[PDB]
Amino acid sequence: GLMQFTLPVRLCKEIELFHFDIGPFENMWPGIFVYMVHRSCGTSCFELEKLCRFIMSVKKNYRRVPYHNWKHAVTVAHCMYAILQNNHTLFTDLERKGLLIACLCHDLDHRGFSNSYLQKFDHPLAALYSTSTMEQHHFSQTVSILQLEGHNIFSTLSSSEYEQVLEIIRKAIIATDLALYFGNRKQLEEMYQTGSLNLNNQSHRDRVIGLMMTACDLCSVTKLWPVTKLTANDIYAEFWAEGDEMKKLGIQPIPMMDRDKKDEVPQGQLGFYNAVAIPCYTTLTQILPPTEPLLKACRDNLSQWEKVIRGEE
Ligand SMILES: CN(C[C@H](O)CO)C(=O)c1nn(C)cc1NC(=O)c1nc(C2CC2)ccc1Nc1cncnc1
Ligand SMILES: [Mg+2]
Ligand SMILES: [Zn+2]
Numbered sequence: 001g002l003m004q005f006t007l008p009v010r011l012c013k014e015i016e017l018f019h020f021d022i023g024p025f026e027n028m029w030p031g032i033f034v035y036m037v038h039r040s041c042g043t044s045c046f047e048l049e050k051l052c053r054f055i056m057s058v059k060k061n062y063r064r065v066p067y068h069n070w071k072h073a074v075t076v077a078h079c080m081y082a083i084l085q086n087n088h089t090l091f092t093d094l095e096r097k098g099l100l101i102a103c104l105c106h107d108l109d110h111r112g113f114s115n116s117y118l119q120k121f122d123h124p125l126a127a128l129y130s131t132s133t134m135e136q137h138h139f140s141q142t143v144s145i146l147q148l149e150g151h152n153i154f155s156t157l158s159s160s161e162y163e164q165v166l167e168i169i170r171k172a173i174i175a176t177d178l179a180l181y182f183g184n185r186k187q188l189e190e191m192y193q194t195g196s197l198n199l200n201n202q203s204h205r206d207r208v209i210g211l212m213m214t215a216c217d218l219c220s221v222t223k224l225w226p227v228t229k230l231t232a233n234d235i236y237a238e239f240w241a242e243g244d245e246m247k248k249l250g251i252q253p254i255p256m257m258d259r260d261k262k263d264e265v266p267q268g269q270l271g272f273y274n275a276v277a278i279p280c281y282t283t284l285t286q287i288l289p290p291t292e293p294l295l296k297a298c299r300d301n302l303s304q305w306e307k308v309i310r311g312e313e
């Protein structure tokens with residue numbers, strides 16, 4: 001109750017900002033998350049003994065992969081923290097509880113392979129779950145860890161509030177399947193443009209939480225250039241290994257995953273910023289004006305990739 005978390009002065013200040021990097025000290029990330037839960041949620045939201053045991057079991061069940069790792073889990077939770085603190089009054093106590101947890105768990109037990117590589121490999125998870133394969137697996141892993149003893153961080157919720165929050169978490173995790181983002185954004189865009197968007201319509205809230213989840217998931221493209229550039233290497237290390245594994249199956253991968261096609265990466269980031277990132281953060285800023293800084297940072301990084309092509313770096 002009276003045990004607050006504090007950070008150093010630089011972190012205490014820079015953590016409120018969207019472009020905050022959680023830094024290379026693994027053992028500080030758990031406190032960074034508790035700090036964000038206590039301020040976003042309150043110091044009463046979670047039994048600290050249970051939250052801390054929950055946080056360490058989630059850490060335990062991320063894998064040592066170049067990108068979809070424990071650092072990603074906390075990075076995506078920090079972006080969701082920033083959005084919640086910039087839209088203080090728009091969200092319920094349960095949504096703020098749920099979403100930060102949704103973020104920390106969204107990629108549990110990720111192996112570094114897309115849903116497509118699971119399908120072509122004929123992985124058992126693709127037989128159990130035909131669409132959003134990894135994402136249904138991530139939500140499965142989250143429920144499992146919540147059911148471990150001393151780990152039920154929601155224990156003080158009523159049967160119905162418990163089922164609301166798991167529903168919020170289930171939909172939030174499923175939304176991180178990018179293949180679902182395109183439609184979700186196009187429907188948010190139209191609803192905004194025809195003035196029919198309504199945050200009292202639960203179906204509408206669901207969609208808007210959807211877009212937040214994509215925005216937090218992609219938030220490595222909203223960092224300062226040196227962080228974005230260095231994280232791009234981690235994401236491509238996974239893509240190249242998946243492409244290698246595609247060749248192992250007898251399938252020539254798309255270029256973005258062909259490690260023999262590095263020369264095409266700057267031009268591929270252009271497409272990616274144009275087709276995915278800028279639209280995502282444009283529609284978010286339209287629905288949530290205080291998230292403008294993510295669009296700005298995303299635009300700066302696009303501008304930086306054009307400079308790479310022009311051989312100015
Ligand atoms: C074009 N589509 C989407 C397809 O239509 C469907 O998958 C792409 O996914 C795509 N195409 N290219 C050439 C790159 C792509 N993705 C990425 O670079 C990329 N992806 C993801 C998640 C959603 C997978 C997170 C970050 C990404 N980059 C990045 C840049 N800097 C720092 N950190 C990360
Ligand atoms: Mg994912
Ligand atoms: Zn993710």
